Amino acid sequence: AVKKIAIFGATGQTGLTTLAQAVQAGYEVTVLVRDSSRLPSEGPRPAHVVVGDVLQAADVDKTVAGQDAVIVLLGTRNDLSPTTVMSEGARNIVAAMKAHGVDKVVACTSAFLLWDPTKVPPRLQAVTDDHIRMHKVLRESGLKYVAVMPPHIGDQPLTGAYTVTLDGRGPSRVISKHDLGHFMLRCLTTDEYDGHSTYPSHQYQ
Ligand code: NA
Ligand code: NA
């Protein structure tokens, strides 16, 4: 089964709770971060910290080596400018997975990849363009890839009670960051979402 995982993006909002939940679940977790002090110094903490940059192939290789599976939660530090930082990070992650024979990757993009393109808000088009590039990298890799395409990510407490919609939009437009992290981890325990797009969502009121 899956026992050793790498998490990319662990210092972001969904990343931090995914990381805590992964450690609590008993995974042996490796993270790649720019600064180890961005991780909590108390509570559940990962087994291995690599300090480096997801845009550097060798730093990513050190992080993927020896893993059973990879979680990808890269973002743009809330910058909406045209960018390739997510897709280029994913390119490095896939390259290292291929070199080491790691097959399983669970990666977050956004529900806008399931929208009619004519309805994506223009202000979010540049970030969505790079999510599309990232999804292409992962789909073309031939790895076992679960495409997680969440709607708006909220701060509601963990429920574990959300809906998972396959290959289409789901009936709520929000998912808590805690439920999203919970779902990321669920995708490590099953192959049934491999090659599919998944949309987690929930009604919190
Ligand atoms: Na970081
Ligand atoms: Na759903």
Numbering used by the authors: 2 to 206
Task: Please quote the paper that reports this structure.
Biliverdin Reductase B (BLVRB) is an NADPH-dependent reductase that catalyzes the reduction of multiple substrates and is therefore considered a critical cellular redox regulator. However, it was later discovered that BLVRB is identical to flavin reductase (FR) that is a promiscuous enzyme responsible for reduction of flavin substrates, which includes flavin adenine dinucleotide (FAD) and flavin mononucleotide (FMN). Structurally, BLVRB comprises a typical SDR fold with a central β-sheet flanked α-helices on each side. Like other SDR family members, the coenzyme binding site is within the conserved SDR fold itself, while substrate specificity is dictated by the variable C-terminal lobe.
In an effort to identify the conformational changes within BLVRB necessary to facilitate coenzyme binding, we have solved the first X-ray crystal structures of apo human BLVRB that has eluded crystallization until now. At the cofactor binding site, three arginines show clear remodeling compared to the holo state. In both apo-RT and apo-cryo structures, R35 and R39 are both found in specific conformations, as indicated by clear electron density. Most surprising is that in the apo-cryo structure, the R78-loop (residues 77–80), which exhibits high R1 relaxation rates indicative of disorder in solution, is well modelled in electron density where the R78 sidechain interacts with its crystallographic mate (not shown). Although this suggests that the R78-loop is “closed” and would therefore block binding and release of the coenzyme, the R78 side chain does not form the hydrogen bond to T12 CO that forms the clamp. To determine if this defined conformation of the R78-loop is an artifact of cooling to cryogenic temperatures, the complementary room-temperature (20 °C) structure was compared. One important difference between the apo BLVRB structures was that the apo-cryo structure exhibited a defined density of the R78-loop that would block coenzyme entry and release, while this region was disordered in the apo-RT structure that would facilitate such an interaction. Such comparisons highlight the potential misinterpretation of structures determined by cryogenic crystallography without complementary ambient temperature experiments. Elsewhere, both apo structures are generally similar, but there are significant regions throughout the enzyme which differ when comparing the apo-structures and the previously determined holo-structure (0.8 Å all-atom RMSD). Specifically, loops 34–46, 115–126, and 153–176 show large displacements and conformational changes with some regions having greater than a 2 Å Cα RMSD.
